[PDB]
Amino acid sequence: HTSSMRGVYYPDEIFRSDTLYLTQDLFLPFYSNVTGFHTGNPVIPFKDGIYFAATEKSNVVRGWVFGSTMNNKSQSVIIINNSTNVVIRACNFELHTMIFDNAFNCTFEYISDAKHLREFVFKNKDGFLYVYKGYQPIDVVRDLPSGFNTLKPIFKLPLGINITNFRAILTAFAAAYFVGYLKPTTFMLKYDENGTITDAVDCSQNPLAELKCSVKSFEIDKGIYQTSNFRVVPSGDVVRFPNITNLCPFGEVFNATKFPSVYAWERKKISNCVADYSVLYNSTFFSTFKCYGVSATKLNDLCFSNVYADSFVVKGDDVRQIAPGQTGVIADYNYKLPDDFMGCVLAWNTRNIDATSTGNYNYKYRYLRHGKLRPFERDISNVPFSPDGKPCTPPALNCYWPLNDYGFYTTTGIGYQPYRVVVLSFELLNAPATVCGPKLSTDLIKNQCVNFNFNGLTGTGVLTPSSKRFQPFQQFGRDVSDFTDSVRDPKTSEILDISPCAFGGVSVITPGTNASSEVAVLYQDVNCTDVSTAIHADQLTPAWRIYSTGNNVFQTQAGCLIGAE
């Protein structure tokens, strides 16, 4: 009455050579509690993923009808084996003889014409029915024997129906069911010659199996080994970046019929938006698209604190000092940039607009100024300059205006053409998220080891509400080890976030695979007091199903060795 390493199926149909692949979608953990019925007439249980197995000869249990609640409440798929005529109907309802009951609406007629132990594993994921077939000659009549029973798929008809039950068992028999539930875990399969498996290691049954799956080898030597214990209890995934808000004004930036000079660059503030970032990627005519702080692609994944826009016109190839560190005449007199800019820049040609064949003298730049400009500094002064005071009335001796106008014309070179540079200054200061990517969010699930994907904080853990010392203007928070400690929700209900996770990754001490079969654990940094409480309540990350505790000893750097006294 226990699944002794039963229910191993191929995760895909791609042929693989001799390697050690790690499977995640595989189900039916080894040594699981199977609800075998060794028999409103049937005993139809909930599906939740099942494992079909018939240990009776003469083909007693030959029909199973998947679907939903009976009595004509939802669509149900009929899989009946009658005289080698497998007709898969998915339209008959129930107000052997459960087919001709009602004929309201029928569609999708599928006809497939053509001791014993037949194993079947049924999977329903995103509306896809996966059916596998496996046979193994047995001789005992006590219970389910051991074995591997490599499964092979036979039918993969989705039907868009979430199966939840199974019925229509024959009569006039023994007659058993042997249906067992499955749990989502991780698996490590072996690929031998001729495309057969013949060996599988479920990384969820014992710490020794987890250690075997860690180093990716079917043999463990003596010593201490551990890799993050990240293949014990997986779960779903939560997301962020809630429903969209008013559109970002980034579109109206690249539409002004007129643009300022270099010394009088306008600073437009952008806040409380959800930037699409579609005008930056598409329309690939930006000849100087560069990013400095963030990656040029990872823009729809972050929530910037505050973004701006700096629009000015430069002359051709003179766009080489709008980068952090570059110096020159347009880097300390007209427009500056900090050493840590953390933003992108763009520049597109405007030869057919800001250029004439008779004089386009409308843009100027500052090239004579006392000292250098500070990061993000603007000066629109207009006065003759001399480093001795010297009000310098223009025509007196040698006074001239420290502003040289450009020479924009039509018949010129590439390096003398008006290039409008729009500088987007991104920020990640301590402030609520004012600009994010066009994504959707879901509900904040509590007390579940789901991976969290916040505005800019990713990872995994048990998201649980708590109480700490937070500030209204502060959105997220880090720990001493540069790890995300707490973060508020961008949508609403600003509360604390995931508490400290499991107390490190426990190591597995094994004195040798060929030596013995014992298993012992070694916790890196724990107190050896609340470990049993966290394990018995299924709240700890390395929580094995078949696991116990014999003795815990607490010393300086204890590392309670559970497994040997």
């Epitope: 990627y281 598409n282 990013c291 963030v294 990656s295 692609t297 972050l302 800019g456 990713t458």
Partner: antibody, heavy 121, light 109 residues
Framework: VRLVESGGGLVQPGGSLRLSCAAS????????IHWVRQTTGKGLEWVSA???????YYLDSVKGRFTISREDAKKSVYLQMNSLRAGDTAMYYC????????????????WGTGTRVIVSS | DIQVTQSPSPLSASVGDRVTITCRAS??????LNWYHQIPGKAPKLLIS???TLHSGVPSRFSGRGSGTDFTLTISSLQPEDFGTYYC??????????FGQGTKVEIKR
């Protein structure tokens, strides 16, 4: 997580020759894919990359000549080389970019095996 | 651009494990720089992260430090299966993903 290359290179300078980069069981619908040019004794000079959106990046030198395209379901990325010159004979790789916290690094996570596109007689 | 210059001389690795792999650059960058490794014959691979996020695949013996503009690659006891050329790349200029030059590590006899 492994990428397998395909094809090679034999055409003369002045022709067209595309490449391909497959994928594996990893979720190849949100990560990035870039190219790498190793001339067997020179620098890894390639910056072209395509992201989740319609982002198409290229190099300043080879601009307007090469085009990039990717397919999510097919798990394949293509790179067509139009108007191929004689100074591109090298081994082309395929890399993937990813940032752990949000954006800081790319790490060039998983490489490939390589594809030699030589242009001579 | 962000001109990065590595060590211009290959470091012949003796029985010791004292390497001085430097990745100095023109401007200053906090952690926008990584380190790779390529055994001659195969494709390159990641060896050292941005000095504070070394993940699996590479043994924990390979350490890394860096701040400002002077980067140092501290490596623990060397192994014979960990030889080849180690490259470093800057992560500041996002479109121009320009790598370094290369530092070869050979055997001393």
């Amino acid at each position: 997580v492994r990428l397998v290359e395909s094809g090679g290179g034999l055409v003369q300078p002045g022709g067209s020759l595309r490449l391909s980069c497959a994928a594996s069981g990893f979720t190849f619908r949100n990560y990035d894919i870039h190219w790498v040019r190793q001339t067997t004794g020179k620098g890894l000079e390639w910056v072209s990359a395509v992201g989740t959106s319609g982002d198409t990046y290229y190099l300043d030198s080879v601009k307007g000549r090469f085009t990039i395209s990717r397919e999510d379901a097919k798990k394949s990325v293509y790179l067509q080389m139009n108007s191929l010159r004689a100074g591109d004979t090298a081994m082309y790789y395929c890399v993937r970019g990813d940032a752990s916290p949000d954006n800081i690094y790319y790490y060039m996570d998983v490489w490939g095996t390589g594809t030699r596109v030589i242009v001579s007689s | 651009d962000i001109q990065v210059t590595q060590s211009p001389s290959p470091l012949s690795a003796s029985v010791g494990d004292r390497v001085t792999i430097t990745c100095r650059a023109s401007q200053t960058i906090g952690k926008y720089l990584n380190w790779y490794h390529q055994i001659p014959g195969k494709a390159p691979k990641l060896l050292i992260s941005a000095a504070s996020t070394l993940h699996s695949g590479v043994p924990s013996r390979f350490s890394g430090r860096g701040s400002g503009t002077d980067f140092t690659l501290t490596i623990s006891s060397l192994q014979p299966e960990d030889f080849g050329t180690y490259y470093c790349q800057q992560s500041y200029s996002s479109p121009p993903w320009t790598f370094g030059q290369g530092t070869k590590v050979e055997i001393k006899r």
